[PDB]
Nucleic acid binder design. Sequence first.
DNA 1: CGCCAGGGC
DNA 2: GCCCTGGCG
Lengths: 293, 295
Amino acid sequence: RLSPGEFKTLISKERKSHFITPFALVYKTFCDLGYDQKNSDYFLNNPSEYIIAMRKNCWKEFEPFEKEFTTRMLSYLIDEERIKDMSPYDAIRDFTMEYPTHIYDLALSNTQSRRSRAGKEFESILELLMMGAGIPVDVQGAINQIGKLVDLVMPGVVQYTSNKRNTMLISAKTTLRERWQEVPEEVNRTGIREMYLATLDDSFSEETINILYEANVVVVTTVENKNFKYKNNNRVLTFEDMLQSAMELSRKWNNVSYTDSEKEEIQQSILKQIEKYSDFPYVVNYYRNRLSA
Amino acid sequence: RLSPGEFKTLISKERKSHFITPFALVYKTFCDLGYDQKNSDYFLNNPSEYIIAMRKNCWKEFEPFEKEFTTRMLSYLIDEERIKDMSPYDAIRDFTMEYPTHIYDLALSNTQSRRSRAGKEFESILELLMMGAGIPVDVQGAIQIGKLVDLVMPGVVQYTSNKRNTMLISAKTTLRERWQEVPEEVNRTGIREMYLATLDDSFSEETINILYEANVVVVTTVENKNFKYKNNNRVLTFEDMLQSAMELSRKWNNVSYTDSEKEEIQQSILKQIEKYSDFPYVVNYYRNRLSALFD
DNA sequence: CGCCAGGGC
DNA sequence: GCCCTGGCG
């Protein structure tokens, strides 16, 4: 047998051993699609195309594996001795009567995985976009003044702490629902000047756009989605717009002299990130460039 | 042979047909447990107990029914002609292999319903608590003010005129990071203070303190306060909240309204009686308030 | 401690 | 258009 509690604990063991991390999957997909071979202008000019292709292919490289995983987990429930000499129809009926909780719990675990993974994959996709564009960023998940809702800080947290002038903060939510309300909260709490909110959401309202606007949160989506749903609306930006802004601001940072301590802190920031991303050559390379400059 | 989209359509049709609404279930449970006969002092004094008993009993009814529903939905995909000559073991194995999107879509639909229902039911339980306590409230789902405010004491008309001596209540069964929505709404509309009712046992001192600076006060059961937040004068119990509501409500007891405000209030109440037309206890609560405008 | 490949109400 | 009987990462 296997109690629902015991099944839940098992579900977790297997998921870990069977699935590579969201960042690992994104990185694999980045390299498989040959994005590690494109120059910086590709990322600057085609971020929507890149995001859409990444999303497409990450899902392709996940979905068949989630399907197999589910079937494996359910196999632990099948009880040969209980069902032996049952009619095949009665065996399935029994299974749908005896285990609809275990079954529900497996699927619940899967959706919860999917939600967390979708967000982390989306953030990873955007992170590699900035790295491919050659734009200096600290990844908050790789190292108050900055809430955890902010994923990317350009050009880094040390510089931002020094002065928020000429910096860019980016948050991401795949869909918004009412969860966009979290963002103005973080903006107001820490005195953030403005924040970019990257999304794939095709359904948010003019009311939402305006409330975010008043709060100095700028919604950024793919050019496809803007043109299809928000074409006229100058308060909705595209990734193309955001990348051009990021690039412009970044240039203000490519010839700066730092104090002993500041340079020390920045080095320590980048060091932390080389450590986190040790196993990913393209990313370690990105940071190394920043460190020797 | 049901396609995944067809199965989704059936699941939605069947769910609508067979499950009563969150409020209807709460109202049934309220009456089944005898709360519809308790005086206001009962609710004033025993809110935490009432809330937990309501939650337990709502779930006791719902969960067996949902289990039976799930089994019934799944039986629409059993294919006799397909499975005729397989062993029972191979039959199940095949089932686990042929319908993964179907089974997942059903469970997904179930948890999404559970999430939506859990919030609506908690809100309904708190609504009936205030009604039982005899405290005047407008229910935002029944008639500026953020859409996450559930109850407005004594009413939206009065609140709009002047928020002095009013009370606003929001509710979230669990907080996660979603508590961040509350300061956003407080700050957007200039809310003086908001009570945030929750059953969550796990929120941090940092969250408490950020909410505190935002003039949002977390309200939870006695049990949760004493187990996890015993020392902490920033975390209130439902008992504390009800005492505050009752004290503020007395300021609204014999208020003389202009004819204009009186007719707007009347409109707001009459609107809510419409929403709750099917629920005698709630209609009677509102008609007492309507009657008070002519007293 | 944040995410929401998120449908339900 | 807000809910999260919500676990995963």
